[PDB]
């Protein structure tokens, strides 16, 4: 019991340094966040030891494109123009304890988009996939979800709604 569904993660972005509310990444198909340490090991006849190299960190994902949108168009501008982007990963079902009562548990990143591929095939909705390269230590916190996007603008049909 209490297993954790993927679709309860909310991924948000905004262009770094401009005063605007973060924009939600709609229609994610799959997602992943990776951290990996580039450790060497040094041998000696007294015995080998392992040396603490630096860590590379990256976020990756796939989404379906749609007509009421302008955000994949921002990702493909950002990868070419080397624009710095802030991003959040927020857990839509862990609320903050007190004072942060209206916020949800999150990681904050800033970094650059490093990949964007469109994939189009006959008999299919075209996908895009991207990679984002994190700068430094990602920062823990609690994040406000943009309530007008997440709960006010509900829609009927197969779009998820309460």
């Amino acid at each position: 019991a209490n297993m954790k569904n993927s679709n309860d993660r909310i991924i948000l972005f905004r262009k770094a340094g401009e005063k605007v509310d973060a924009t939600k990444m709609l229609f994610l198909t799959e997602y992943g966040l990776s951290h990996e340490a580039d450790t060497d090991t040094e041998d000696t006849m007294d015995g080998s030891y392992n040396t603490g190299g630096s860590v590379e960190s990256t976020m990756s994902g796939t989404a379906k494109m749609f007509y009421g949108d302008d955000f994949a168009d921002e990702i493909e501008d950002a990868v070419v123009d080397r624009v710095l982007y802030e991003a959040w990963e927020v857990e839509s079902r862990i609320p903050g304890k007190n004072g942060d009562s209206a916020k949800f548990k999150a990681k904050y990143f800033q970094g650059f988009h490093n990949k964007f591929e469109l994939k189009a095939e006959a008999n299919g909705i075209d996908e895009y996939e991207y990679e984002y390269g994190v700068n430094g230590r990602f920062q823990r916190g609690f994040a406000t979800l943009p309530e007008a996007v997440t709960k006010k603008l509900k829609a009927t049909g197969y779009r998820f709604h309460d």
């Binding site: 948000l12 905004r14 770094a16 340094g17 401009e18 005063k19 605007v20 509310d21 973060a22 802030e86 959040w88 927020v90 916020k103 904050y108 800033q110 700068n135 430094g136 920062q139 823990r140 916190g141 994040a143 406000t144 979800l145 943009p146």
Partner: peptide, 12 residues
């Protein structure tokens, strides 16, 4: 960098 909230009131 530190943590910044999603909203325009906590812009970078």
């Amino acid at each position: 960098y530190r943590f910044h909230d999603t909203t325009k009131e906590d812009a970078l």
